[PDB]
Amino acid sequence: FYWLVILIVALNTLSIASEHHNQPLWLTHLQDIANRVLLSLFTIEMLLKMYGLGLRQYFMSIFNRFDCFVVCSGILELLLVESGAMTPLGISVLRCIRLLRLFKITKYWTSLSNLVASLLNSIRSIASLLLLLFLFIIIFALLGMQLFGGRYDFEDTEVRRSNFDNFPQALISVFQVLTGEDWNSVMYNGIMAYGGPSYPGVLVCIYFIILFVCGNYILLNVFLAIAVDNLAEAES
Amino acid sequence: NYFNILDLLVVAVSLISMGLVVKILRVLRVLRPLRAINRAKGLKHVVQCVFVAIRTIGNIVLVTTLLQFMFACIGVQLFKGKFFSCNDLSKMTEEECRGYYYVYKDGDPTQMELRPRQWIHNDFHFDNVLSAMMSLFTVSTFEGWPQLLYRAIDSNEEDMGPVYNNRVEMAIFFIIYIILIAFFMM
Amino acid sequence: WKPFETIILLTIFANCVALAVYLPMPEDDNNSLNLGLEKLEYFFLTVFSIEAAMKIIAYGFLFHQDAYLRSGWNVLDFIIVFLGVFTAILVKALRAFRVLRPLRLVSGVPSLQVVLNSIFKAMLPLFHIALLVLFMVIIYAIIGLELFKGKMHKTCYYIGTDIVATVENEKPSPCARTGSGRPCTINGSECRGGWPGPNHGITHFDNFGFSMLTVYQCITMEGWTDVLYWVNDAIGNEWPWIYFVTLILLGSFFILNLVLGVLSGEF
Amino acid sequence: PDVCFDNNVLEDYTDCX
Amino acid sequence: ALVRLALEAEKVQAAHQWREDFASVVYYNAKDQRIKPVFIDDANFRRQVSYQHAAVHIPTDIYEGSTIVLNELNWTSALDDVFKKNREEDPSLLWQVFGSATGLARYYPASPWVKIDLYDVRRRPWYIQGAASPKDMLILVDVSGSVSGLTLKLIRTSVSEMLETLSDDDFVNVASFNSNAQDVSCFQHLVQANVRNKKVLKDAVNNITAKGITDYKKGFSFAFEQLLNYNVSRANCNKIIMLFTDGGEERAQEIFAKYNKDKKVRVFTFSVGQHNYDRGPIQWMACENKGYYYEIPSIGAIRINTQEYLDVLGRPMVLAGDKAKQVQWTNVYLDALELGLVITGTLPVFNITGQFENKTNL
Amino acid sequence: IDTFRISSAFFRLFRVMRLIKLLSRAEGVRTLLWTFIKSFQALPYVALLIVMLFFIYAVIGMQMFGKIALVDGTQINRNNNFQTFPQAVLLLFRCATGEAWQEILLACSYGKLCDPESDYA
Ligand SMILES: CCCCCCCCCCCCCCCCCC(=O)OC[C@H](COP(=O)([O-])OCC[N+](C)(C)C)OC(=O)CCCCCCCCCCCCCCCCC
Ligand SMILES: *[C@@H]1O[C@H](CO)[C@@H](O[C@@H]2O[C@H](CO)[C@@H](O[C@@H]3O[C@H](CO)[C@@H](O)[C@H](O)[C@@H]3O)[C@H](O)[C@H]2NC(C)=O)[C@H](O)[C@H]1NC(C)=O
Ligand SMILES: *[C@@H]1O[C@H](CO)[C@@H](O[C@@H]2O[C@H](CO)[C@@H](O)[C@H](O)[C@H]2NC(C)=O)[C@H](O)[C@H]1NC(C)=O
Ligand SMILES: *[C@@H]1O[C@H](CO)[C@@H](O)[C@H](O)[C@H]1NC(C)=O
Ligand SMILES: *[C@@H]1O[C@H](CO)[C@@H](O)[C@H](O)[C@H]1NC(C)=O
Ligand SMILES: *[C@@H]1O[C@H](CO)[C@@H](O)[C@H](O)[C@H]1NC(C)=O
Ligand SMILES: [Ca+2]
Ligand SMILES: [Ca+2]
Ligand SMILES: [Ca+2]
């Protein structure tokens, strides 16, 4: 079972990653039988651990508690299709649930348990700062909606698509100029919305400067709190 | 490497011996100065110190290239056949995005130009798991996601052109993943 | 008492939702929900005033001791002025100050008093790095000001018209009738003075403030190639490459040692 | 003119959309 | 001769069966499988004609073979024998023509059509005349603060493309609404829609400003008063209120119960631009009042949308198909084929595909 | 002497360099530049691999992505050639600072024109 499971798992991750657009006709028939076949190996593999390992030992391990949620969900999604009463919005959702099988591969990686203990220790050193970053990107989203606020009218036909005339559109658009990507075209619209280039009007550069300097200096400070947390483990 | 670049530059003389294979052996002569780099000593300290660091970070790099496979397969699943846009944004399906239309210049309807129309396929589509690791590699490098992100918003059913601001809820994919990859790159 | 924090936490969080559903409208328009939320501010005007006047009765002028409470009366003292200017109507400057209210949400909830206190303590060893980037911009603003004043203003208009001539994706990039830059071969067009200009007027090199704006954008490596390829289109190439590829190579090098700056003080 | 045609009882307006 | 073309066109239309594939058609395509026939220099037409085929004009916005067009070249090919019949019955006939609701024109004698050729046959004064009854239109234009930007510039274009579809029996007025209401035209009542009176409207519409608050109740109640005023001298026919709003959450339910109890005012509503507003109520106003909701994404859809509003006004005519076939002559206009001043006689062709057997009748 | 002349544009730079006399007295800043000039020890051998990197990828693409027909509007244009050697170094310095390298990739393809100075007859 160090080698019987891999032929199944590597055969699963080729089943779930075939996925064309057209899939001529025979491929999409193989997608459903494979899922039907490879669950029949999944349950058995699980069920052999149910008897000859100990019941309390099996559920205590977190990685095999994960394998419980896999095998149950495979059965729930197959029978719900046979029930027939399911929206076409939902069968796409069930299909995305299988995709969680890719972590079955991660029963490997020998330092996996060292690795998660490295990462999850880091997040609880960031969850103070990361909640400051999200409340920073809200103030600048509530500000930009007041300054620009559907002044992107312009009487033209080109798509000034990162406008602020909504709450989510101003939450995409701030997070676009936060990560640096194409804040140039954005700033050239806030300048041209008010008074394009003039005296009073180009002082709306100041909105896209403080958003890009302060909005990165917060994000440069999540770079330290990791580095003081990732340095404590290096002492030992 | 000295015996590899020399044997190919010699066979270009065998390839120039026929013309009187050609340009491939010309470009195998570029390796030369690499040999002069092994005659430099400063790098032995720098390159060696970095491969120390790869041994301990390898574990993270092997996980962050799993997410570009896992979010490829959820990315394929959710955007198959979308991003398939017709040239004049008014025709919405296969057969009828054909023939000639009007491109109005600047802004006013007195400057009609007549171009043809065809399906434009948006070049970084999510069709194959291989062809979705391409596109999700560029939004990983923070370059060109807005144009692509704002396309993933505008999409609807399988072979249909974009509707204007349909389903902004599919901007959560490009955010969580972008934020995650920003956390494993850091 | 005890939960007086909790009642004020639950009412500032309402402001966050009250300003999230505020849908803005282009030329003085108001929907219905936008029109009801204007009146809901007067609820959050008086409850933040019922709170704060009790904070005065609680101690007095010494209860400006917490600097995070010092902003507390500051937020309220603008909106009372906003009610005065409201009666002048029977203007949009105080509209933007209500955005500041969730900063009160910081001062209420502790543990984020840990974060903002810790975030200013990183700013002391970074000061010499940031002041050299401030001298890095001023050198390359004056050099780009004297080398490129007025150089962009050429156009490629049509024959004699006002239309700038482009091709289908081509940005409206400048010309020169004299040598080294753009023959303007768009077939029925002649380069004439006036204004083709960079992005719409915003990417010049005249007037100290524009030079300093367009060597800023260039420093962040974003769009530095349009400001290169516009100069390179107006002067002519082979000289102005050495301006921008030393602004990138020094702009890279002195942010590359800003990231290593912060990681000094806390290690 | 003198003809004109408007408003039959049938019609059946159930399209628009 | 018109009766002969209307009697045969309908007869052939009944036996059609809707072919879907087309691996079997051969028409002319007069703008350049297909035909390339002989030409006679003829002098009544002052031009080269064929006398052996009809030609076809398919407007260059449409076409690839799209089986709505391509199927209508099938049954229309029958009118070839009856076009050819009338030259032998009486010579010196000028252009016979079957226009069609999908935009084609078969016209015998076939001839080369006269850089861009715009020419939609469905907006031709000789089509918009015998395709409906006369019209007391009234155009309401949302000029509030929310239309500014793109979606206003589409209204200034589209009214100017709306008013071109009016004959000289039809009356209009153009009325903006916003905070309050007003007839931004300098007329204050319904006019004649001459050549001249439509020019005042095209300078009033092109100097609309956009500011204020929508209300829809001071607007419609100004619209139904204008379609009173019997004082004037209106045409007393199809009353139309057309609405160029962008969006809004207001079913004006208190107004149509006030004025449209008898349901005698058709309300066509358009919603222009790519605003992200509620198109919910605007679809409601038109499906309660015998209207028809249309939508306009951008420039280009304007020419196709503001002509399909005459298919709704043809709905009362088709229900009197025995006696609606009068002949309706058009008052003088210059031919598009370069012939001189010509006057046309028109007659509608209606869809008879179940009649006297009657049928679901869809 | 001109008042008795475009070439004076370099000499003007000398007028600007007086601002660098400022940092002379700024003792806390000069001590930070001088640290980097003292640090320029293990850096420039790593910079030798950067130069080599740009040199190999220039020459590999120059034989290969030439013939590429500098039509403007199509993102391989007269400012952004692949043809000569220093135009192909700058293109790679565009992709090294991430400046929209995703288009250049789409500019090299299978169906681009072939620059009517080549053969292709
Ligand atoms: C401490 C935390 C930060 C505090 C948050 C708030 C910061 C201060 C915000 C200033 C309020 C600006 C008022 C907005 C409306 C402008 C007035 C107007 O309508 O005129 C329109 C006119 C025309 O624009 P228009 O054409 O779009 O409007 C036309 C409509 N009518 C006719 C009704 C007005 O524009 C002008 O010519 C005057 C512009 C006013 C001056 C512009 C400065 C505003 C931006 C300054 C940058 C502030 C950055 C904030 C973030 C930095 C952090 C400190
Ligand atoms: C519209 O086009 C279709 C074809 O595109 C025409 O249908 C054709 O009609 C003729 C006579 O109605 C058919 O001829 C018949 O052939 C069979 C043998 O195939 C023979 O047994 C019959 O006696 C008769 O001669 C012809 O097959 C048919 N074509 C197809 C593909 O079915 C139709 O006539 C066109 N409409 C008009 C008004 O012209
Ligand atoms: C046309 O409409 C006008 C309304 O503007 C009518 O004027 C009113 O006539 C009645 C007669 O019953 C008077 O009681 C009102 O005072 C009049 N209105 C005003 C504002 O003075 C007019 O009668 C109508 N008919 C004609 C032929 O003009
Ligand atoms: C435009 O260019 C084409 C070919 O380049 C040429 O045939 C044509 O005459 C040119 N137009 C004018 C007005 O010269
Ligand atoms: C009326 O029609 C008949 C039928 O051909 C024709 O002979 C006659 O000349 C026509 N009348 C006139 C006045 O042309
Ligand atoms: C609006 O435009 C018309 C037509 O040019 C003109 O008569 C009128 O004076 C204009 N009104 C204003 C306020 O500019
Ligand atoms: Ca970047
Ligand atoms: Ca409105
Ligand atoms: Ca970028």
Side-chain angles (χ1 to χ4, degrees), chain A, chain B residues 12 19 21-186, chain C, chain D, chain E, chain F:
Chain A
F1 286 175
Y2 183 73
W3 290 100
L4 186 144
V5 181
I6 291 176
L7 290 174
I8 304 168
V9 171
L11 183 57
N12 193 6
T13 185
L14 291 177
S15 177
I16 203 59
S18 178
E19 294 293 327
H20 294 174
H21 189 198
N22 292 318
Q23 297 174 352
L25 295 69
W26 55 266
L27 270 166
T28 182
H29 291 91
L30 294 181
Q31 301 296 322
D32 294 336
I33 60 95
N35 203 22
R36 273 185 189 182
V37 169
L38 294 178
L39 280 177
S40 182
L41 298 175
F42 267 27
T43 61
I44 290 176
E45 164 192 61
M46 180 179 175
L47 188 61
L48 295 178
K49 304 298 288 294
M50 294 295 288
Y51 293 108
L53 188 70
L55 198 283
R56 189 175 179 181
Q57 181 53 249
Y58 185 74
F59 289 92
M60 188 272 173
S61 62
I62 303 171
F63 293 158
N64 293 319
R65 179 72 180 94
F66 182 80
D67 200 5
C68 296
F69 180 75
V70 171
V71 172
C72 294
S73 62
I75 296 171
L76 294 181
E77 77 184 13
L78 191 151
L79 300 176
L80 181 58
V81 177
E82 190 271 329
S83 67
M86 192 64 204
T87 61
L89 182 143
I91 190 167
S92 235
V93 173
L94 297 173
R95 194 158 297 172
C96 232
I97 298 185
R98 317 206 250 241
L99 292 161
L100 184 76
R101 269 160 210 196
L102 299 174
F103 288 165
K104 216 172 257 302
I105 306 169
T106 60
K107 231 178 309 131
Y108 316 63
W109 294 190
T110 58
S111 192
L112 170 58
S113 64
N114 193 6
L115 181 58
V116 177
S118 179
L119 297 174
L120 191 147
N121 194 7
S122 66
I123 302 171
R124 61 182 63 250
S125 178
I126 296 303
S128 298
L129 271 162
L130 189 57
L131 180 53
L132 189 275
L133 183 67
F134 179 69
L135 194 144
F136 184 83
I137 206 167
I138 288 298
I139 300 302
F140 278 87
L142 293 178
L143 184 61
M145 194 193 297
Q146 300 299 115
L147 306 181
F148 301 132
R151 297 178 195 264
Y152 290 0
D153 51 357
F154 282 60
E155 201 181 359
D156 288 329
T157 56
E158 67 271 13
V159 281
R160 329 217 190 277
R161 189 66 189 270
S162 65
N163 50 2
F164 297 23
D165 193 74
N166 197 358
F167 187 76
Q169 284 302 120
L171 206 61
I172 304 297
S173 184
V174 170
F175 186 73
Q176 177 184 358
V177 312
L178 191 67
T179 180
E181 171 35 45
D182 197 75
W183 67 275
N184 211 4
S185 181
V186 177
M187 187 187 81
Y188 292 145
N189 293 317
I191 296 167
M192 197 177 67
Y194 280 7
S198 72
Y199 167 30
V202 189
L203 296 179
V204 189
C205 292
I206 295 174
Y207 181 79
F208 303 106
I209 298 304
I210 279 90
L211 179 47
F212 187 76
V213 169
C214 293
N216 219 159
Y217 180 72
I218 310 296
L219 194 152
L220 181 149
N221 199 8
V222 308
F223 181 76
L224 275 77
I226 292 174
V228 297
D229 193 10
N230 200 4
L231 183 141
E233 61 90 15
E235 300 175 354
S236 62
Chain B
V21 175
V22 176
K23 304 293 179 66
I24 300 174
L25 303 177
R26 171 184 160 89
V27 182
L28 294 170
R29 211 197 33 242
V30 309
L31 187 62
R32 286 203 208 208
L34 280 204
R35 185 165 82 255
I37 297 171
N38 283 320
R39 299 178 181 180
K41 267 92 187 178
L43 294 177
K44 279 42 140 30
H45 187 271
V46 173
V47 179
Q48 186 177 6
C49 183
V50 171
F51 285 105
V52 173
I54 297 173
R55 262 222 126 55
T56 63
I57 296 302
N59 230 257
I60 295 174
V61 189
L62 263 291
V63 175
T64 187
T65 186
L66 186 65
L67 298 181
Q68 291 182 356
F69 185 80
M70 186 185 71
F71 286 171
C73 296
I74 195 169
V76 170
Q77 192 57 251
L78 203 162
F79 301 114
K80 285 193 291 182
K82 287 81 175 177
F83 303 22
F84 225 81
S85 62
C86 180
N87 198 359
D88 52 345
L89 281 77
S90 173
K91 300 298 282 185
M92 293 296 107
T93 180
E94 169 53 314
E95 178 64 27
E96 67 186 4
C97 178
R98 285 179 184 179
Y100 295 108
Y101 72 107
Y102 298 108
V103 174
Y104 290 101
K105 286 293 180 64
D106 300 33
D108 52 352
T110 58
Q111 253 108 61
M112 50 187 67
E113 303 180 355
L114 186 139
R115 337 206 136 302
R117 66 265 184 97
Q118 76 275 16
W119 284 121
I120 288 173
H121 191 66
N122 196 3
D123 290 329
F124 276 156
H125 57 95
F126 297 6
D127 219 333
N128 314 324
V129 182
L130 182 62
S131 174
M133 290 193 291
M134 173 63 73
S135 172
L136 204 66
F137 176 68
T138 66
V139 311
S140 173
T141 63
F142 295 155
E143 166 35 75
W145 65 283
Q147 311 172 344
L148 175 140
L149 158 43
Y150 278 127
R151 196 82 182 64
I153 286 174
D154 305 351
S155 65
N156 60 350
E157 301 178 358
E158 287 289 328
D159 290 329
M160 288 178 71
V163 184
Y164 176 70
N165 210 161
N166 187 11
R167 61 190 192 179
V168 196
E169 297 181 353
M170 289 176 182
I172 193 146
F173 166 74
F174 275 147
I175 304 196
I176 316 158
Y177 165 89
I178 194 167
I179 300 283
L180 292 175
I181 286 300
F183 171 65
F184 290 109
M185 197 69 68
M186 193 185 292
Chain C
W1 201 19
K2 183 178 178 182
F4 190 79
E5 291 179 353
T6 307
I7 307 300
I8 303 304
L9 190 159
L10 288 176
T11 187
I12 300 168
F13 185 78
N15 241 119
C16 178
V17 181
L19 281 177
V21 192
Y22 181 83
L23 199 156
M25 281 298 179
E27 297 290 331
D28 193 359
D29 192 82
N30 281 321
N31 295 319
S32 298
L33 172 55
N34 194 6
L35 190 62
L37 289 180
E38 184 70 27
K39 295 183 183 296
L40 188 59
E41 185 180 3
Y42 297 166
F43 179 75
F44 299 111
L45 188 152
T46 184
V47 176
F48 291 162
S49 299
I50 285 173
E51 180 185 3
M54 290 177 184
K55 310 288 277 191
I56 299 171
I57 294 172
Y59 293 89
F61 289 155
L62 192 145
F63 199 62
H64 303 286
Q65 190 63 254
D66 286 326
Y68 293 95
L69 294 179
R70 292 182 183 183
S71 177
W73 286 272
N74 195 3
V75 171
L76 188 63
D77 284 329
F78 289 115
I79 307 299
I80 296 300
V81 177
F82 177 77
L83 191 148
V85 185
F86 180 76
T87 63
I89 306 300
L90 295 176
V91 178
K92 291 181 181 180
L94 292 174
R95 275 286 189 60
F97 277 168
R98 63 183 66 180
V99 177
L100 185 61
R101 300 202 176 119
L103 276 77
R104 248 244 152 139
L105 177 57
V106 167
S107 301
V109 177
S111 299
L112 277 73
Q113 295 300 113
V114 178
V115 169
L116 283 178
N117 284 315
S118 179
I119 198 157
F120 291 163
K121 291 182 66 64
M123 195 172 175
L124 273 71
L126 187 153
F127 179 68
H128 295 293
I129 304 293
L131 186 145
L132 192 147
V133 180
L134 194 32
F135 287 167
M136 187 225 166
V137 178
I138 295 300
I139 297 299
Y140 287 104
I142 300 300
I143 285 170
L145 184 61
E146 299 182 353
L147 289 175
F148 311 120
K149 277 186 291 186
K151 246 117 214 101
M152 295 287 187
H153 287 268
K154 246 55 128 85
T155 316
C156 272
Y157 294 122
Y158 282 141
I159 297 173
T161 60
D162 196 77
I163 301 172
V164 185
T166 59
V167 185
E168 295 178 353
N169 280 318
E170 195 258 332
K171 297 288 182 67
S173 59
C175 172
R177 300 181 66 180
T178 317
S180 296
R182 279 196 67 192
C184 197
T185 63
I186 196 176
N187 199 2
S189 70
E190 288 293 326
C191 293
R192 85 124 152 315
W195 184 241
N199 287 291
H200 291 278
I202 310 171
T203 319
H204 302 174
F205 274 96
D206 32 273
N207 208 123
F208 189 56
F210 286 158
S211 73
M212 191 176 172
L213 177 63
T214 66
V215 304
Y216 181 77
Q217 80 174 205
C218 175
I219 272 182
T220 67
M221 289 84 170
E222 163 35 53
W224 65 270
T225 196
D226 286 333
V227 189
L228 170 62
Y229 296 162
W230 280 335
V231 172
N232 193 314
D233 225 6
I235 297 173
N237 37 12
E238 90 200 3
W239 297 107
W241 63 270
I242 198 169
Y243 177 70
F244 295 104
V245 307
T246 60
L247 180 54
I248 301 304
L249 268 64
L250 272 73
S252 177
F253 186 77
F254 295 109
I255 68 99
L256 187 155
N257 214 143
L258 195 154
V259 176
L260 298 180
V262 286
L263 178 146
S264 70
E266 292 292 327
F267 275 185
Chain D
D2 276 347
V3 290
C4 225
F5 288 153
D6 193 2
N7 289 320
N8 290 116
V9 176
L10 337 183
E11 194 137 5
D12 235 339
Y13 32 105
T14 35
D15 260 328
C16 83
Chain E
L2 279 177
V3 178
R4 302 173 162 174
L5 295 173
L7 282 176
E8 279 317 306
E10 288 185 348
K11 180 174 184 181
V12 173
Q13 173 57 40
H16 181 71
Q17 296 294 321
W18 187 263
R19 294 183 183 273
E20 178 65 30
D21 55 352
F22 287 95
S24 67
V25 183
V26 183
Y27 51 104
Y28 176 67
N29 199 4
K31 197 180 265 78
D32 57 354
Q33 66 182 358
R34 295 178 179 90
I35 301 171
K36 64 283 189 185
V38 295
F39 282 153
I40 299 168
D41 289 331
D42 196 0
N44 293 113
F45 292 85
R46 290 182 177 92
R47 196 178 183 181
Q48 289 177 306
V49 298
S50 69
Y51 283 159
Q52 295 178 356
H53 299 288
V56 173
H57 179 272
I58 305 172
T60 63
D61 192 359
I62 297 188
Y63 212 66
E64 191 267 332
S66 67
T67 65
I68 306 169
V69 174
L70 189 62
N71 199 6
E72 195 174 6
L73 295 176
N74 198 165
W75 62 271
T76 45
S77 64
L79 305 158
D80 263 355
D81 185 76
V82 185
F83 287 166
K84 260 180 178 141
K85 184 178 179 181
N86 292 321
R87 295 287 294 165
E88 293 293 329
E89 184 69 25
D90 188 358
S92 65
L93 292 177
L94 298 175
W95 310 99
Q96 296 174 357
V97 54
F98 176 76
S100 177
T102 60
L104 302 180
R106 289 176 65 89
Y107 56 99
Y108 179 79
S111 183
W113 186 265
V114 301
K115 294 190 287 185
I116 299 94
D117 189 7
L118 284 76
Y119 198 82
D120 191 352
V121 62
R122 293 171 293 171
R123 298 183 77 251
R124 233 50 236 317
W126 64 268
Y127 186 77
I128 309 194
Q129 174 271 158
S133 65
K135 299 179 289 292
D136 297 332
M137 190 186 290
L138 178 66
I139 293 169
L140 298 173
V141 172
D142 189 358
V143 299
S144 65
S146 65
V147 300
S148 68
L150 178 63
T151 72
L152 182 63
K153 185 177 181 178
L154 290 173
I155 300 170
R156 295 171 189 170
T157 299
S158 174
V159 177
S160 177
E161 295 293 328
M162 180 64 70
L163 299 175
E164 297 293 330
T165 64
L166 293 161
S167 62
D168 294 330
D169 294 330
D170 303 336
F171 287 84
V172 291
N173 190 356
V174 176
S176 69
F177 63 92
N178 184 23
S179 74
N180 32 24
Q182 62 180 8
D183 298 315
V184 54
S185 297
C186 178
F187 291 113
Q188 295 178 358
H189 64 283
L190 293 177
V191 299
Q192 221 272 129
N194 295 114
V195 175
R196 177 85 259 245
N197 290 320
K198 293 189 286 188
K199 182 63 173 64
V200 183
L201 301 172
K202 294 181 184 179
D203 289 332
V205 170
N206 292 321
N207 197 1
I208 283 173
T209 61
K211 61 183 181 180
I213 298 170
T214 241
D215 57 354
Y216 291 91
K217 292 180 180 179
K218 295 182 181 181
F220 283 90
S221 64
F222 182 78
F224 289 91
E225 293 293 329
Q226 294 292 325
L227 299 179
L228 304 199
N229 227 153
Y230 286 65
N231 296 2
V232 175
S233 86
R234 283 130 71 276
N236 289 318
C237 193
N238 295 117
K239 301 176 181 64
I240 304 299
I241 298 175
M242 306 189 79
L243 186 63
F244 287 91
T245 184
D246 54 355
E249 64 279 15
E250 182 67 28
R251 286 80 178 271
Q253 295 179 357
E254 295 181 354
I255 302 300
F256 301 101
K258 219 153 286 157
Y259 296 100
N260 281 322
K261 287 183 180 180
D262 292 331
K263 304 295 288 183
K264 292 180 181 179
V265 176
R266 282 174 168 86
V267 179
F268 297 141
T269 56
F270 305 50
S271 68
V272 302
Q274 289 179 357
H275 61 279
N276 42 84
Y277 287 152
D278 193 1
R279 294 177 180 176
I282 307 167
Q283 293 180 359
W284 183 74
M285 297 180 187
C287 292
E288 189 188 6
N289 294 318
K290 291 183 180 180
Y292 192 75
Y293 177 74
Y294 295 94
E295 181 180 0
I296 295 167
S298 174
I299 302 168
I302 290 169
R303 204 245 319 155
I304 302 168
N305 287 318
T306 67
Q307 59 178 355
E308 297 293 326
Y309 100 66
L310 291 169
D311 288 334
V312 180
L313 292 169
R315 289 178 183 173
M317 287 180 65
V318 61
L319 275 301
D322 289 329
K323 294 181 180 180
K325 287 185 177 182
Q326 295 180 358
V327 187
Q328 264 247 60
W329 300 94
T330 308
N331 70 350
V332 293
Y333 63 136
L334 283 175
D335 200 355
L337 283 184
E338 308 278 337
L339 187 65
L341 271 72
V342 293
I343 178 171
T344 69
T346 54
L347 186 66
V349 172
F350 300 105
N351 188 357
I352 298 299
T353 187
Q355 188 68 39
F356 291 91
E357 299 294 328
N358 289 317
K359 252 256 157 124
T360 61
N361 286 318
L362 185 62
Chain F
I1 285 177
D2 184 27
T3 60
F4 288 103
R5 71 165 255 234
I6 302 172
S7 60
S8 63
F10 175 70
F11 288 94
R12 289 199 225 195
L13 267 64
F14 286 158
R15 219 200 32 212
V16 177
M17 301 290 282
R18 295 165 182 167
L19 304 175
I20 306 171
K21 292 171 68 175
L22 289 169
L23 73 133
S24 182
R25 224 311 120 46
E27 185 179 1
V29 180
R30 80 158 161 123
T31 187
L32 193 146
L33 288 178
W34 177 78
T35 302
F36 295 160
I37 305 302
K38 206 258 154 144
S39 58
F40 251 48
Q41 259 209 203
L43 182 67
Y45 289 101
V46 187
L48 200 281
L49 283 177
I50 306 293
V51 172
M52 250 70 153
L53 185 67
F54 282 100
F55 183 75
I56 295 172
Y57 279 102
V59 177
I60 288 179
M62 185 175 176
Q63 294 192 0
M64 183 176 60
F65 292 147
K67 297 180 182 182
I68 203 62
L70 311 171
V71 175
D72 195 356
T74 64
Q75 191 65 257
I76 290 180
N77 54 7
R78 82 280 188 192
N79 283 137
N80 211 179
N81 315 301
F82 222 91
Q83 293 173 356
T84 72
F85 180 73
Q87 292 291 281
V89 173
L90 183 61
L91 186 150
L92 267 68
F93 190 75
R94 185 169 196 259
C95 302
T97 55
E99 249 296 278
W101 63 271
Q102 45 183 355
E103 256 157 42
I104 307 137
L105 157 88
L106 272 51
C108 301
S109 63
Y110 174 47
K112 304 295 184 284
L113 285 82
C114 202
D115 198 6
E117 216 161 316
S118 67
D119 301 334
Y120 74 100

